[PDB]
Design a protein around this ligand. Structure first.
Ligand code: SF4
Ligand code: SF4
Ligand code: SF4
Lengths: 150, 262, 386, 157, 157, 64, 286, 134, 199
């Protein structure tokens, strides 16, 4: 079914028209990234259904008819800088085949101190550094005593 | 060492060190400002790079009174800009130009001596605000250096030629009037410039009474031979069977020479 | 006392972690001098500064191809001096997972030997079942390779519910995977001509050369530690012993395959006889208690405090115990002074003994067969260099 | 016909170069190039089959054995007087007399000849080989057998 | 001028595209982490899917992944092979033994981290790390290569 | 093998396009689809006679 | 014109060799229950291109203790021989065209030998000789097979030749054992399984390594075209792809032989069989 | 090549023909049947391509100088090579016979050649010369 | 098959033995001699025309048209269990207070010596850490810390994709561990809700 195939392609790519899709830079990068193109064109377009959407906009799909270890797959919204670190933990367990619980069917308990998921900052100057690092805001001298000043 | 359409000699050698010294004095917590120049730096030289170097040294001295100026000569090393280009000119080339007689005197030095010199300069307080010149324990000419290099390479064919300076300039004139409006090219020796020719018309050694390695309690190791000469020997791998040479019969094992009866 | 004089032949076989120096009068090898120690991590001295429980992960990385077998010998050596009896269900689990580990070691060994010979398909094919068994390991210990599952007096945790289901499901097709694996080399003239009558070993030399595991079996020698000196529930297990009589690389190949078959048989027998009961020894003064027990009882809390800081004090003494490792006989000599740290722990590795046979075996052979000798020797330098 | 004549001249140039150099590997490489160019120039004489025969035989068979013998028998002995002892002047003087000025040429009194392309017939060649010189073909068979048996009897063991 | 800068940027994009997607490492079967490395190239994970080929020589090797502990006796050989790596080159640190010594960090013969001998671009943690983790680390290496801009630097030199 | 099938078709298509282009180019060059035929000195003589006759015709063409 | 034809032949050769190594990887994966190169471009339709460009930008390293001229020229010589063989396949009219290509293939032995003497590697010194001896031994049997083929190659004029366009447009059902032995000899000529024991280019790098692989796969394709013309009754892309598919099939299913073992096999089973078949064909064709 | 006599030009006179031959196009169907000429031009083109591919990485690759980077990581051959020599010479002998319509006595003489060949070869076989233990 | 043949032995001592001694005949594992024209033709079909390569070829070709087990990372992941031991992390109580009470059992039990702890009494009288550092480049991920802790403070989280470009980023302090715990608390709590029946 070509109409169903294109409907699935639009609802997975997140665009509005086939002209909007084929003319978008995301398609152009799909012409150079085979894994991303495979996501967009093959795995998401097969038999199966959507599961849910996280606050990062990523989509989750499941296909019970597939073989074990390949039933579930995710589409990252960030088409140019896709990264697994942005997947929230409440989808991490279902994605990693560790539990059969997802937000769409399981109501977890959210702590008030919960920090949301996002991209890694590794390789950048804004990433974490130990308190004795030169990038730290205020350098620490870890001497365990006080020096006498006149 | 070469001018570029995006960076000129003045931009690298005068303004940036001056602003750096200004900001260093503005910091107020900096204790030692170490600047580097050439032994051949002098304000009355025809060479533009040497003149810019001297001007930048004077500007740094005026801006920062306590900065220490270091003016080493030829520095040798594995990836240096002195022996490697000389090899690229002796080999991989049809002929080697040499400026005039080439009897100008230079005092090549080793990099590890310079590193220990930096350590000692940081150790010695008195050297602040001064100028130190660095040179080897020997004085040699360009001809002598070329002869010793040919011995090291064991080349049986002297490809060097002694030519008048104007001829060398005319050889390098076309590529120096196009040095600008160009983002720079690889595999370009720093030797194909008129400033190099002007360098080869004057001696480049430590001035009499200058502050040197002895002031640091440092004995400059041998540059002509020693551990610093092993890397250049690896062009000839030190010599097992390379080349056709027979004059090397001096170091050949005993029984082999009686085999060849010399 | 010895000069050099004649240089003549000179060779260097590999800094990359086996270093081999050989001597040929041409195309035929006359001498072969391995040099080892590039992986000698000095673990035995390091063991002296660790508690018995602290040093347990050291045994994970001695043979990182076969782990639980390495754990088992050290655990048994501890327990025998500790005079501790192991519960039945724990013995069942230990034997079953040991058989699975032996299967993994045989699979990886045969595939690497094939790749060295030149066959690449079985490598990739068998690594899929290897990944399956890695999933099995992770389900039960949270680690793919370095489980640290075996414990003094039992195991860390009981098997999760639903594991034996997938174990049986895997066994239901492992025979088919092995069958399709055999057809690529078994009926091949090339594989045989590469392997037949290469590195022949006698029973007399093997017992002189201290062989163990499948290499011993291929010389017409009836020997299995699981049948002569049984440990845990191996005495109850009924299985056959493959026997060959040429001492050939092809013979060792077939012996390992039939060993895999017997391991599958033992896996089935363990699957259909799993008992219900305790998996840890009931001595809390050696075995850690349950977390629920710890959090509601003063005595278990105190024992958790002491064992997890100081650990149990083995009585002074000495013992040596060995286990029928997939690569041979893996033994550990334990020296006890009376404290909470082992005084001296010597480790015996079968591959180290097998690796000593290269010079005499490689004589009369060809450079195309040195790799064959190494591959059929089935040697891990982690145990060889400790 | 500049390039054809240049290729013709290259043959004697390579011939002199073969003895000129001191590296045995260089000599063998020069000989291989000379054989190839010789066959190519003889191809201008219309001998397609014979050129391929010469190429095949000398390159694939003989030069390979040359390089093998040298590589199994020759540590570099170039400095072992191969550069320090030089060359005999009488040899080069005699060679000059013989080949530069050629006081005794092949043609002798004749000083000019016309070179004309041929027409190689493998059919006529086979007719001759197996009807007119069959006896010499069998003699060549015997010579090949002589070579084989002598080689295998002179084996160094 | 702007068009030339645009061409430079696009050429840098293409160069990064080529260099990232065709990284060929060299095999150091040092210790435990190699087994995870071997399984990473297997059918389930297919390192070859990501343009990864293991080469027998450093000369074709693009980057080094340290899979296993490094001893003092092995450090000179590792430096030997890395110094045989041609430019541009990178180093990937996989495993705590490679990271900082880990479970042999106080041994007498263990180099406490391969950092002390050679530079490292990627540090992959785990004892052993997951083959999935090795995939993630090599993808992060690709991301680092992506941000590289060489001809952009050279045009402004 | 669905992943290798694109490569399988591409190899055949590449060789097809190359052979077709070479066919067209060599047909334009030689102007008969038989130039690869075996030729003896007899056919060579006929061909060279014919070529020289065409040249002679052109020479006599520029004479009327 | 001639130069343009040479280039028009060159382009599909390089593109298709890239595709051949890619498809060999991918089919090996398919036969190994994996996918193979799939991320590097659409379904991985870009892997060899980036690999070639990467080895292009990679640094070429030259030993300082040998003759680097031979080190450079040996892959150059092999590549030149591959191009010349392709030209003789498609751009030739020689009466002994098959013999021409046979003599050409005889020349490719030197590149391995040149590399083996060039670098200061002992195992290169040994493996180069081993591969040389293997190909040299099998060359005689290949020539004998061509001798057998030439016993029936006739043109309309009645002259016996080796022209490709005059080869019959039908398969030679009467020389199937000869065809099989020729195919195995072709397998041996390309250092493929079960003759991949010898690599010789271990100390090589960069576009030198790329050119070595180009020459290897180009010689494989040349031999494939030769086999298709000789036994399959014509020259076509379909037959080239089928022969390559079968060669990948054989590589992915078999281990390699030992050195003296394939020496014995070639010198006691293949050459005498080709000799007897040549004698029989000559006898019957009378 | 260009013709230099009217006899070579089949006694066709004129200047147009000389210049026509001077700047002719190569044609197998023209004046150069079985010419082997494209081999040389193929050699030139391949030399150019190989030289360029040698040069290019010396331009677009960074360089670093290291001491250790500049370092490398029997009679059976005699028997085989000499046997190959002799047998290839014999194959060259055989080749013209396969290119002719030989007669029965020609066939018998060819068989005589082959008989001597196989006699020597079989003698080498029976003496252990084809067993490559050494 | 596993049978052996004369000439198919890969050696010289054995080959020279069998061609000059019939010892292989006494061995039953060697295929017995053909006795008729039919058996001779069977042997010829065995040796010539391959017929041994053919079977493995056919099986591999069937594998070509067979399915695959390849997964598309990162858009697909593997299968793991709650017992998975990954990145160490620090847990709190639902009110927000740190679970770790600086009993230093984790540091005592750790055979990697990768845990450095300093602590004192807080201004409210609470016994809390002042320095809590674990060297991930030195941590062996054994999980013995997770076994020793009696308040479920230190846990190896389900995070395993935390490789960094520099080694310094892996020198985990108290603050980063608490950040990781606050990030991954829900998954860890869910896993504990399962693991509690076994731990
Ligand atoms: S990090 Fe751990 S698993 Fe990896 S090699 Fe080291 S000890 Fe083995
Ligand atoms: S993490 Fe747990 S075991 Fe470690 S000091 Fe804190 S409370 Fe004690
Ligand atoms: S998991 Fe093991 S190595 Fe890591 S902190 Fe806990 S006890 Fe130490």
């Amino acid at each position: 079914s070509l109409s169903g195939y294109f409907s699935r392609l639009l609802e997975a790519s997140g665009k509005k028209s086939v002209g909007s899709f084929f003319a978008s830079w995301e398609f152009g990068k799909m012409l150079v990234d085979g894994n991303l193109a495979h996501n967009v064109l093959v795995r998401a377009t097969g038999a199966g259904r959507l599961v849910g959407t996280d606050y990062n906009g990523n989509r989750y799909y499941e296909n019970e008819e597939a073989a074990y270890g390949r039933r579930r797959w995710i589409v990252y919204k960030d088409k140019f800088d896709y990264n697994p670190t942005t997947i929230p933990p409440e989808w991490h367990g279902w994605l990693n085949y560790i539990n059969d619980y997802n937000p769409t069917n399981t109501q977890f308990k959210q702590p008030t101190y919960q920090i949301e998921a996002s991209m890694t900052k590794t390789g950048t100057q804004t990433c974490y550094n130990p308190k004795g690092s030169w990038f730290s805001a205020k350098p620490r001298n870890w001497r365990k005593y006080e020096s006498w000043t006149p | 060492r070469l001018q570029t359409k995006n960076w000129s000699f003045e931009d690298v050698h005068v303004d940036f060190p001056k602003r750096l010294a200004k900001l260093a004095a503005e910091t107020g917590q900096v204790q030692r400002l170490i600047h580097f120049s050439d032994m051949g730096a002098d304000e009355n030289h025809k060479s533009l790079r040497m003149r810019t170097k001297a001007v930048g040294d004077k500007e740094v001295l005026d801006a920062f009174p306590d900065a220490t100026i270091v003016r080493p000569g030829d520095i040798v090393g594995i990836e240096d800009h002195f022996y490697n280009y000389l090899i690229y000119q002796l080999t991989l080339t049809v002929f080697a130009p040499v400026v005039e007689s080439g009897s100008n005197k230079i005092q090549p030095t080793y990099v590890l001596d310079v590193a220990d010199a930096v350590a000692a300069l940081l150790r010695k307080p008195d050297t602040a605000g001064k100028t130190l010149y660095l040179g080897g324990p020997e004085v040699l000419t360009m001809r002598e250096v070329y002869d010793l290099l040919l011995k090291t390479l064991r080349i049986y064919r002297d490809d060097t030629v002694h030519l008048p300076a104007w001829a060398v300039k005319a050889m390098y004139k076309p590529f120096d009037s196009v040095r600008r409006m160009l983002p720079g090219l690889p595999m370009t020796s720093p030797l194909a410039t008129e400033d190099y020719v002007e360098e080869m018309l004057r001696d480049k050694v430590v001035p009499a009474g200058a502050l040197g390695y002895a002031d640091l309690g440092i004995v400059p190791q041998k540059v002509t031979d020693g551990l610093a000469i092993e890397p250049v020997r690896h062009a000839r791998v030190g010599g097992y069977r390379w080349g056709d040479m027979s004059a090397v019969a001096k170091d050949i094992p005993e029984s082999v020479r009686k085999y060849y009866n010399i | 006392l010895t000069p050099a004089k004649v240089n003549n032949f000179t060779l260097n076989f590999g800094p990359q972690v086996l270093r081999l120096v050989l001597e040929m009068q041409g195309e035929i090898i006359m001498r072969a001098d391995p040099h080892i120690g590039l992986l000698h991590r000095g673990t035995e001295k390091l063991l002296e500064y660790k508690t018995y429980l602290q040093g347990l992960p050291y045994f994970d990385r001695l043979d990182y191809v076969s782990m639980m077998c390495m754990e088992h010998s050290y655990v048994l050596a501890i327990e025998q001096l500790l005079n501790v009896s192991v519960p039945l269900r724990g013995q069942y689990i230990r034997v079953l997972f040991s058989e699975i580990t032996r299967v993994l070691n045989h699979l990886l060994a045969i595939t690497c030997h094939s790749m060295d010979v030149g066959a690449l398909t079985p490598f990739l094919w068998a690594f899929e079942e290897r990944e399956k068994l890695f999933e099995f390991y992770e389900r039960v210990s949270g680690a793919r390779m370095h489980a640290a599952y075996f414990r003094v007096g039992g195991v860390s945790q009981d098997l999760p519910i639903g594991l034996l289901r997938d174990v049986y499901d895997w066994a239901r097709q492992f025979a088919s995977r092995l069958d399709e694996m055999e057809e690529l080399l078994t009926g091949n003239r090339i594989w045989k001509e590469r392997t037949v009558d290469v590195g022949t070993i006698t029973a007399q030399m093997a017992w002189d050369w201290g062989c163990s595991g499948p290499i011993l079996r291929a010389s017409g020698i009836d020997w299995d530690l699981r049948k002569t000196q049984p440990y845990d529930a191996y005495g109850k297990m009924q299985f056959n012993v493959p026997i060959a009589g040429h001492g050939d690389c092809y013979d060792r190949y077939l012996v390992r395959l039939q060993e895999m078959r017997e391991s599958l048989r033992i896996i089935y027998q363990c699957l259909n006889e799993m008992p219900d009961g305790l998996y840890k020894s009931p001595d809390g003064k050696v075995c850690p208690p349950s977390r629920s027990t710890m959090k509601q009882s003063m005595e278990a809390l105190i024992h958790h405090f002491k064992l997890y800081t100081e650990g149990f004090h083995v009585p002074a003494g000495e013992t040596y115990r060995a286990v029928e490792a997939p690569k041979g006989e893996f033994g550990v000599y334990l020296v006890s002074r009376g404290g909470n740290r082992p005084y001296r722990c010597k480790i015996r590795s079968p591959g180290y003994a097998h690796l000593q046979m290269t010079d005499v075996i490689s004589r009369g052979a060809m450079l195309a067969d040195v790799v064959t000798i190494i591959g059929t020797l089935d040697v891990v330098f982690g145990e060889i260099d400790r | 016909m500049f390039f054809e004549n240049s290729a013709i001249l290259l043959c004697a140039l390579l011939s002199i170069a073969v003895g000129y150099t001191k590296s045995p590997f260089m000599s063998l490489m020069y000989s291989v190039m000379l054989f190839i160019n010789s066959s190519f120039v003889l191809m201008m004489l219309g001998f397609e089959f014979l050129a391929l025969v010469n190429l095949l035989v000398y390159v694939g068979a003989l030069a390979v054995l040359f390089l093998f013998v040298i590589m199994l028998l020759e540590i570099p002995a170039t400095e072992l007087r191969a550069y320090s002892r030089g060359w005999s002047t009488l040899g080069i003087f005699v060679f000059i007399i013989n080949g530069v000025f050629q006081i005794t040429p092949s043609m002798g009194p004749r000083g000019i000849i016309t070179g004309l392309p041929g027409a190689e017939s493998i059919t006529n060649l086979g007719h001759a080989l197996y009807l007119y010189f069959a006896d010499l073909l069998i003699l060549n068979s015997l010579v090949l057998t002589v070579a084989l048996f002598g080689r295998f009897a002179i084996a160094p063991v | 001028a702007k068009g030339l800068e645009f061409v430079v940027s696009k050429v840098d994009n293409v160069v990064n595209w080529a260099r990232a997607g065709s990284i060929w490492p060299m095999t150091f079967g040092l210790a435990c982490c190699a087994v995870e490395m071997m399984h990473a190239g297997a059918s389930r994970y297919d390192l070859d899917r990501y343009g990864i080929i293991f080469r027998p020589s450093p000369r074709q090797s693009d980057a080094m992944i340290v899979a296993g502990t490094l001893t003092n006796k092995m450090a000179p050989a590792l430096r030997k092979v890395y110094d045989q790596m041609p430019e541009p080159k990178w180093v990937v640190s996989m495993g705590s033994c490679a990271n900082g010594g880990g479970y042999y960090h106080y041994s007498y013969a263990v180099v406490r981290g391969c950092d002390r001998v050679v530079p490292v671009d990627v540090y992959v943690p785990g004892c052993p790390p997951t083959a999935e983790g090795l995939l993630y680390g090599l993808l992060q290496l690709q991301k680092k290569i992506y941000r590289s801009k060489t001809t952009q630097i050279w045009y402004k030199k | 093998g669905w992943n290798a099938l694109p490569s399988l078709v591409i190899i055949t298509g590449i060789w097809t396009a190359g052979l077709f282009a070479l066919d067209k180019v060599q047909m334009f060059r030689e102007n008969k689809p038989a130039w690869a035929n075996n030729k003896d000195g007899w056919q060579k003589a006929l061909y060279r006679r014919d070529w020289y006759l065409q040249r002679e015709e052109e020479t006599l063409a520029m004479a009327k | 014109m001639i130069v343009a034809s040479i280039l028009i032949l060159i382009v599909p050769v390089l593109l298709s060799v890239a595709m051949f190594t890619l498809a060999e990887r991918t089919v090996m994966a398919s036969m190994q229950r994996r996918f193979g190169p799939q991320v590097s471009g659409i379904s991985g339709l870009l892997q060899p291109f980036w690999d070639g460009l990467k080895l292009g930008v990679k640094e070429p390293v030259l030993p300082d203790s040998s003759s680097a001229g031979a080190f450079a020229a040996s892959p150059m010589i092999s590549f030149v021989l591959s191009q010349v063989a392709w030209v003789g396949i498609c751009i030739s009219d020689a009466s002994f065209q098959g013999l021409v290509i046979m003599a050409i293939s005889s020349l490719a032995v030197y590149g391995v030998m040149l590399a083996g003497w060039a670098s200061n590697s002992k195992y290169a010194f040994l493996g180069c000789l081993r591969s040389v001896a293997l190909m040299v031994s099998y060359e005689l049997s290949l020539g004998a097979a061509l001798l057998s083929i030439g016993l029936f190659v006739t043109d309309g004029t009645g002259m016996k030749c080796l022209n490709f366009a005059e080869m019959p447009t039908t398969p030679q059902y009467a020389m199937l054992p000869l065809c099989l032995i020729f195919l195995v000899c072709i397998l041996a000529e390309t250092k493929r399984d079960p003759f991949d024991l010898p690599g010789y280019n271990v100390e090589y790098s960069s576009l030198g390594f790329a050119l070595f692989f180009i020459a290897e796969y180009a010689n494989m394709a040349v031999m494939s075209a030769i086999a298709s013309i000789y036994f399959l009754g014509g020259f076509s892309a379909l037959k080239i792809t089928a022969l390559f598919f079968a060669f990948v099939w054989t590589r992915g299913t078999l281990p390699r032989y030992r050195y003296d073992q394939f020496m014995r096999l070639g010198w006691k089973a293949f050459l005498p069989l080709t000799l007897a078949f040549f004698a029989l064909h000559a006898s019957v064709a009378i | 090549y260009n013709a230099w006599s009217p006899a070579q030009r089949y006694f066709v006179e004129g200047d147009h023909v000389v210049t026509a031959e001077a700047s002719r196009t190569f044609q197998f169907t023209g004046l150069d049947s079985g010419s082997f000429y494209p081999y040389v031009i193929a050699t030139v083109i391949a030399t150019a391509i190989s030289t360029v591919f040698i040069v290019a990485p010396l331009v677009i690759a960074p360089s670093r100088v290291d001491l250790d980077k500049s370092s490398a990581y029997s009679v059976s051959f005699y028997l085989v090579s000499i046997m190959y020599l002799l047998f290839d010479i014999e194959i060259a002998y055989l080749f013209p016979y396969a290119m002719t319509h030989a007669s029965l006595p020609m066939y018998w003489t060819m068989n005589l050649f082959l008989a001597i060949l196989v006699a020597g070869f079989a003698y080498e076989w029976g003496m252990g010369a084809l067993e490559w233990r050494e | 098959g596993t049978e052996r043949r004369p000439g198919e032995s890969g050696a010289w001592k054995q080959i020279e033995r069998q061609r000059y001694a019939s010892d292989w005949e006494n061995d039953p594992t060697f295929k017995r001699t053909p006795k008729n024209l039919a058996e001779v033709l069977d042997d010829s079909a065995s040796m010539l025309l391959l017929t041994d390569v053919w079977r493995g070829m056919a099986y591999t070709l069937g594998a070509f048209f067979d399915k695959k087990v390849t997964i598309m990372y990162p858009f697909e992941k593997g299968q793991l269990s709650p017992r998975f031991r990954g990145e160490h992390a620090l847990r709190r109580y639902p009110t927000g207070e740190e679970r770790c009470i600086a009993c230093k059992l984790c540091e005592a039990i750790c055979p990697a010596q990768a845990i450095t702890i300093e602590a004192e009494e807080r201004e409210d009288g609470s016994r809390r850490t002042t320095r809590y550092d674990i060297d991930m480049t030195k941590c062996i991920y054994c999980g013995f810390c997770q076994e020793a802790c009696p308040v479920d403070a230190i846990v190896e989280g389900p995070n395993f994709e935390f490789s960094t470009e520099t080694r310094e980023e892996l020198l985990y302090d108290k603050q980063k561990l608490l950040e990781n715990g606050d990030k991954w608390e829900t998954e860890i709590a869910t896993n504990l809700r399962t693991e509690s029946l076994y731990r």
